Design a protein around this nucleic acid. Structure first.
Ligand code: CA
Length: 86
DNA sequence: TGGTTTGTTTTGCTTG
DNA sequence: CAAGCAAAACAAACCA
């Protein structure tokens, strides 16, 4: 097993999180929520004391890879919609 | 206000 | 080298 959560990469997980939404787009917070609810390894690492490292990598992957694109959100103070780049 | 989130980038290290 | 994990500097936007 490549990582402690399996053979899927962070990018792969982010992809599954987004593909799981009916609208094919999720905010950063929703992607975190999907990890904690969907990946066994992260189930007990959603708290502030242990989520810093992996959340940082999620933000890192989202910005770094062209596979993901950011879309301006609707309304005041809401963060971007993240989706798969066609 | 002043701490927290979100987002962008760069760097270090390990593998195939 | 490319893929990827991990750590981290910085800064605009948020928001309690
Ligand atoms: Ca991107």
């Amino acid at each position: 097993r490549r990582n402690a959560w399996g053979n899927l990469s962070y990018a792969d997980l982010i992809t599954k999180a987004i593909e799981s939404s009916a609208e094919k787009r999720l905010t950063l917070s929703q992607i975190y929520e999907w990890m904690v609810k969907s990946v066994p390894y992260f189930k007990d690492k959603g708290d502030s004391n242990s989520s810093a490292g992996w959340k940082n990598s999620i933000r890192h992957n989202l910005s770094l890879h062209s596979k993901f694109i950011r879309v301006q959100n609707e309304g005041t103070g809401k963060s971007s919609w993240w989706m798969l780049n066609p």
